[PDB]
Symmetry: C3
Subunit: 431 residues, 3 copies
């Protein structure tokens, strides 16, 4: 009574002989690796052309010239850079506003007018933008740039490893979920072995706030998916930044007729150009910024073109091998396992240690919150299992469950384990 | 008869019983991901030691001292950096050539002599290289560096995903191509099931221009293949640069006796040293450059040692399982599919959406330009398929073909989808 | 007499019907890719606040103020950066110690006092830290930073590709090592086909030193929780020379105690130095704030303990035991050694090496290169591309006696430097 038939993988696909088999659906199993939050590196810049020598180089102190909302937002950004250039200083009077106070680095100006920004002389640059001064022309330029994290551009990313396509079948109305790990279905006619195509490899789950979008791969940061937020800003706890980070933006004062404007600014470069005012004692500012990676990411557009609504699976078909063989039924232990300890992390990519005592009566088909971690003979057991569920852990051999003792941390905590975050401070003492 | 035999994977390998099976060849199937153009980061530098104070800091303006072809080529390079140092300026006369015009940043000089290059004073540096001046010694130094894309070093790269080794067999003269997805063959009066080793994982195809060279992996930029052009400069459309880019080169004027010369320059650093001239009012220049990645890539040499002429496959053997069973013949629809729409991209790594209507008379074994995308029951179908062929798309169920409606972009267009390329400009208005 | 049973993967797991099958152990096979040495990017900084204008800006020359051991260690580091700032110079006398010698870049000072460090004026910065001078207050600041490679933080890393879980079985007292490549076993009068789960994909072997191996599952993924892996950082293929991605030279800044910049944290690679007012006359302390690479300092024993396992990972199973009455067709095999065998390329590198020679007559040669299976070949000329895990010399066999092959095979470190010219690229521009 041995038979063979091909079963297609599309909805509606079904075989009739010798035993009717219907394709009920297609899903997937995996070992989740939660990377936390990802976002593009968004270089944002602001500033002002000022026909004055301001005494307070800050968003509040420059409120009369610098756009209020962009200043506050860019000031709170990552790798902030700001420069205040004195184009034409006070000829007389004032308070630490003469040209002499604008030495390279502006320490003389900073003594009387403290600021978190760099202060530089720019005497020699065109002061033509500031007109309508009968005796003393005054001109300064402010530029501010940082990598701003836009909430609408932030995505939660879960990497899917050890991916297994689940071919959900109905074998004469009896549910059977086949994978490369478990390709057999018990049938009274005899065992059914399903020949399945290989698994699709690693997947990328982009979580939008809740909808999931799918990527196939690591991702590949060297191919068409180079602009993926995964290839950019990484925050494991959706608060603190880790790993690769661009340098602080390079701010430059570039006059309108400077030959440098014939070329484009490089990544992280911000060029500011004073615009001649239509009004007396006023001027505009044109900003040219070189974005990270040579392009600005448009998140809804990137997600729509670089992801799918469902995870990818091979086209099939599935090879249905109907056999006359009847599997030997082994006696299973149904009592819960004892003294179970779970140590490590979950959804992290590092297998957690699961140890305990398997009871008598047969092999314990051990589950940790419903997750199959293998079968163990009666007695002490030790296993390294990749867990997808958080603590508390309910442990079972197939029957009743028991509460295991756990010392398990979350993926964000794992990302900060083995590292000391932040500024490293040291003091050199006098002899 | 129910029989088993091992078949080796080498040319000439063949088994005779119960039915002869000959290894006709070994090839591969994959889902192509075209990354476009890749090249190493080649830091190239030029310049000149000048016994004059030039008024035009450009390739044309410095034509009397700077080598012509290297200047023009390096000027057009990526992340260009250039500095003009005044070692010994005019003591009197001239036009914006006195020491006073060389303030830090050289804005006073630039006002009368515009240049895209940085201008800096260098008055405490040795002027010994410029001799033969009776009254006023004049000396300047020019340095120019960028990341030049050498055409002989540029490689077209296609990433191969979902790789399937194709074991081309001849079963009693009948062609059968076995993979992990399709391991069955028809024998005169039965069925052959071929046990195959796993697929080799992702491949890297280096396209020399036309010859193809093969890499096994992602590649791994952290191992012996670290210097792969894939790990470096990425241009998806073989014109515009994307992603990771080195900073602009750091140019330094370093005197012959400076202790800094006892150490090597870091990556992207360019040190220029004036060489005492054999002729009056003339001098040479010695350039020390720290290449990106601490080494200069020799492309024909790298390709020869880090790639193979053919894709890698496991050694085998193949397990030939001879069965008396015959597959159940299902009715196949031969009429072409109706209203087929193809949306997305090809050779991009994102599955394209294929939708239409499968005709009556059985399952439609759907092909998109000969590529198998699965079998579908009659009626409406929807599938996410990774396409290797460009539009137009010929769609078939196994018989006659029909032209499908398509909105499919190329891999280069996909790489620029979801991003806004180039300089981001913003204008700050006057109040 | 067709039979089926599930075999669990735990040590001691066994089935008795129809043929006794015992799980002896679990091992793995792979194609090794030796990456050499890996370590975190450790930004280390030192310096001193000096109530003097030193004439020798070096560790020895600044021995009276700069901590001796940190100076020497940081000076020998990667991407070294050092700056000497003149806060308050000599008002009169001295030797190239006046304010005029401290022009931007300090070339005038450097003419008489050479140094590998940057020299900068800092005359508008607070000199309050240096007191007890009746006539001429003198003050300078030195800062030194680099990426120091700590030996206790350096790990040897071998990447494992084409990984195959080895299920070691005892089939009716006979050893059988089942993999996805070789899933068949002989039973007394039949054949056992073992259904196995897929292989776990690539592995990362972290080697510390006596010598202990720790295991990672993956590439690794530098974008997830294992971002701080030394593999994601400093790479030295020959455990001597650095290659690839390298941070920029540290950015040293002299930052006064009341500067608003101190309300923010320094960025990666940034080093901010702040003079501390001395409790003694003509002396001052220095406070250093450094932004580590990757925003955190890696603690190696702690990272390894949490981000690795003692053994490589394998799926939970069970294994599907398919008992058949079938017997494999015995093909005649050549036992004589292969001749004129040449091996070219590299080993433990990730690039298949070329193996060519002459297989003898009288059957297929089941070729081994230092015990490694590279496939079976019919009599005569053969050519194969094989990933080798063993170094030269190469002993070649068809299953019987072995012969010495001729080899032109380089090690993984040599492969990493093949196709590249290491170090400084020099060029000369001639006079016209
Ligand atoms: C198959 O999967 C579905 C969905 O998870 C589940 O409801 C069903 O019980 C499973 N069947 C078996 C036999 O495990
Ligand atoms: C096997 O592949 C070859 C080469 O692509 C082709 O000519 C042949 O028709 C294929 N055979 C079958 C049965 O598909
Ligand atoms: C620094 O390097 C030199 C030269 O290799 C060596 O002589 C010296 O011992 C090293 N010092 C330290 C502390 O590593
Ligand atoms: C199985 O592996 C062990 C350990 O490597 C080895 O000693 C034994 O000979 C192997 N058995 C076979 C049949 O290859
Ligand atoms: C450019 O930026 C400035 C200041 O940040 C203004 O917001 C301006 O309106 C911007 N341009 C546009 C139209 O977005
Ligand atoms: Ca003025
Ligand atoms: Ca002169
Ligand atoms: Ca003094
Ligand atoms: Cl079978």
């Amino acid at each position: 009574e041995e038979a063979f038939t091909y079963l297609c993988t599309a909805p509606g696909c079904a075989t009739q002989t010798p035993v009717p088999v219907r394709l009920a659906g297609v899903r997937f199993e995996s070992k989740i690796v939660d990377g936390g939050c990802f976002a593009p590196w968004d270089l944002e810049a602001t500033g002002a052309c000022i026909c004055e020598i301001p005494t307070d180089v800050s968003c509040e102190g420059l409120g009369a010239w610098v756009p209020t909302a962009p200043c506050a937002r860019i000031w709170n950004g990552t790798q902030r850079a700001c420069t205040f250039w004195a184009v034409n200083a006070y000829s007389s009077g004032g308070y630490a506003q003469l040209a002499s106070y604008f030495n390279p680095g502006g320490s003389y100006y900073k003594q009387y007018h403290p600021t978190a920004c760099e202060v530089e002389p720019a005497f020699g640059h065109s002061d033509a933008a500031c007109w309508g001064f009968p005796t003393d022309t005054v001109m300064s330029v402010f530029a501010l740039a940082s990598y701003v994290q836009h909430p609408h551009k932030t995505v939660r990313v879960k990497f899917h490893t050890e991916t297994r396509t689940v071919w959900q079948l109905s074998v004469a109305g009896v549910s059977c979920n086949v994978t490369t790990e478990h390709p057999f279905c018990n049938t009274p006619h005899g065992q059914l072995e399903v020949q399945v195509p290989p698994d699709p490899g690693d997947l990328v789950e982009y979580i939008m706030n809740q909808q999931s979008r799918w990527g196939l791969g690591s991702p590949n940061c060297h191919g068409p998916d180079w602009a993926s937020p995964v290839c950019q800003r990484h925050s494991p706890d959706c608060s603190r930044l880790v790993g690769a980070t661009p340098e602080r933006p390079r701010l430059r004062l570039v006059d309108a007729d400077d030959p440098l404007l014939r070329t484009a600014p490089g990544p992280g470069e911000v060029w500011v150009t004073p615009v001649i005012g239509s009004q007396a004692r006023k001027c505009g500012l044109h900003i040219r910024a070189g974005p990270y990676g040579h392009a600005t990411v448009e998140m809804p557009e990137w997600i729509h073109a670089h992801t799918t609504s469902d995870p990818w699976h091979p086209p099939g078909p599935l090879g249905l091998k109907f056999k006359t063989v009847r599997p030997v039924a082994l006696p299973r232990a149904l009592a819960p396992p004892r003294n179970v300890r779970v140590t490590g992390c979950y959804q992290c990519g590092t297998p957690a240690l699961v140890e305990g005592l398997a009871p008598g009566g047969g092999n314990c088909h051990l589950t940790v919150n419903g997750e199959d971690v293998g079968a163990f003979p009666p007695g002490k057991f030790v296993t390294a299992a990749l867990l997808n569920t958080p603590p508390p852990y309910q442990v079972s051999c197939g029957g009743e469950s028991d509460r295991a003792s756990a010392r398990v941390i979350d993926p964000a905590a794992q990302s900060f384990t083995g590292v000391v975050y932040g500024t490293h401070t040291t003091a050199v003492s006098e002899t």
